[PDB]
């Protein structure tokens, strides 16, 4: 078989550039490793960038997000006895965040793809990605037990953080940046109502806890734990416990409690290639950078990925214009790292971390103090949460 351009990974990145080069006349086949039914248990992200929101709507899939997603203009930090709320609307210049469920996104563009025939082959086994650096590459990958053979003019890597792409990358080209928390968030889904309209961010002296939403009917929340603990450790009511015990009195109480639907252990870390290609190998989302889900920027940059992508791939086909691709790299890479440090500084500032001496702590506790109480300081911090424009 033959297509135009071959996407490992039918995750949110993998399926909205499905859907995009689809829409625009470009043939391409999404090989995922995983059935249908196991990506869409997959919980994950919650918040997204008014950029990413436009880029559904290119894509002609927004239909049930305009409906059931929760536009949000503002979002609190407590820390030190104190609720604080950042005005994103007003600071960022008129911008906002949409509370969408990641599962919701991805269930929406599976449809949409199903519907328009593309492509799609699950279960595709032991993916091999060959000749990158030729005019013809190809995947070769098991169906069923048969080894078949994908010939296509790019592929473009869409495979998350534990992908075979970023692999099939000379590591001697490669040059990676790093930085391990020594913490994960245990997060819990639950068909509760939300203990507020908007976002709470705790910094507690027992560590980070977060307030969530997907509906004014279920809620997901989050507490910081050592990357030592084991889900099966913490019951429904050890986790309601904890949560309240971390949270400002008058938020704690008005808590409606339940039990869990999804409860899961995501570790916290920093992770960036450069370059983000190799040859007619493009990589986008999380295939080639991870980013702690503090400041909720992941899949919002697997967004701005993909559109570039997308459109450097337009000119190539539309416009004979193929030696723009050779751009990707330093065009994402820009918007990359500066996501990048804001998740670091939010990771920073919110979370406990072992081992910090009087200094660091006094520190962490005027870094909130200055960004909350200075008017610049608080625009630093919206127009980075809604989103820094896409170049
Ligand atoms: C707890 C948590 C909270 C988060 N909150 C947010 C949020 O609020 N906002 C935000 O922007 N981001 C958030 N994120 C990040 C976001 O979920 C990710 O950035 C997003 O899932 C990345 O999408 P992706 O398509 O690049 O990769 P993934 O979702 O990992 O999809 C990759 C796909 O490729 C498939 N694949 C892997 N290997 C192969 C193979 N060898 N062959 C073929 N297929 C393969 C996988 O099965 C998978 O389906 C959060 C993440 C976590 C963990």
Same mark, same amino acid.
């Given at each position: 078989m033959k297509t135009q351009v071959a996407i490992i990974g039918a995750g949110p990145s993998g399926l909205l550039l499905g859907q995009l080069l689809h829409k625009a006349g470009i043939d391409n086949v999404i090989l995922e490793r995983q059935t249908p039914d196991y990506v869409l248990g997959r919980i994950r992200a919650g918040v997204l960038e008014q950029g990413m929101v436009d880029l559904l709507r290119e894509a002609g899939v927004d239909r049930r997000m305009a409906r059931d997603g929760l536009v949000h203009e503002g979002v609190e930090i407590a820390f030190a006895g104190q609720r604080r709320r950042?005005? /994103?609307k007003r600071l960022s210049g008129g911008k906002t965040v949409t509370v969408y469920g990641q599962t919701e996104v991805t269930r929406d563009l599976m449809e949409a793809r199903?519907?328009?025939?593309?492509?799609?082959? $699950?279960?595709?086994?032991?993916?091999?990605?060959?000749? /990158?650096?030729?005019?013809?590459? $190809?995947?070769? &990958?098991?169906?069923?037990g048969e080894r078949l053979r994908l010939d296509?003019? $790019?592929?473009?890597?869409?495979?998350?953080?534990?992908?075979?792409?970023?692999?099939?990358?000379?590591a001697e080209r490669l040059k990676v940046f790093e930085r391990v928390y020594? &913490?994960?968030w245990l997060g819990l889904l639950a068909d509760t109502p939300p203990v507020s309209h908007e976002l709470i961010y705790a910094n507690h002296p027992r560590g980070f806890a977060l307030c969530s939403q997907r509906s004014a009917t279920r809620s997901r929340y989050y507490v910081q734990v050592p990357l030592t603990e084991k889900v099966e450790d913490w019951s429904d009511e050890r986790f309601w416990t904890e949560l309240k015990a971390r949270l400002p009195?008058?938020?704690?109480?008005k808590l409606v409690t339940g039990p869990s639907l999804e409860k899961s252990i995501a570790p916290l870390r920093? &992770?960036?290639?450069?370059?983000?290609?190799?040859?007619?190998?493009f990589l986008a989302g999380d295939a080639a950078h991870i980013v702690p889900?503090?400041?909720?920027?992941? /899949?919002?940059?697997?967004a701005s990925d993909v559109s570039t992508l997308y459109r450097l791939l337009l000119k190539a086909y539309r416009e004979g214009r193929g030696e723009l691709l050779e751009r990707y790299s330093a065009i994402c890479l820009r918007r990359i790292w500066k996501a990048e440090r804001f998740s670091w500084w939010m990771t920073?500032?919110?979370?406990?971390?072992?081992d910090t001496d009087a200094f660091s702590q006094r520190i962490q506790q005027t870094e909130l103090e200055y960004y909350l109480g200075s008017e610049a300081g608080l625009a630093t911090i919206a127009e980075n949460y809604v989103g820094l424009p896409y170049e």
């Open positions: 950042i005005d /994103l199903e519907a328009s025939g593309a492509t799609t082959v $699950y279960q595709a086994a032991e993916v091999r990605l060959h000749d /990158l650096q030729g005019e013809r590459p $190809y995947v070769t &990958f098991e169906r069923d296509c003019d $790019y592929i473009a890597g869409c495979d998350g953080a534990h992908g075979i792409s970023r692999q099939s990358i000379p020594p &913490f994960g009195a008058e938020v704690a109480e920093s &992770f960036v290639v450069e370059p983000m290609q190799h040859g007619r190998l889900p503090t400041g909720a920027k992941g /899949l919002n940059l697997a920073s500032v919110l979370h406990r971390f072992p």
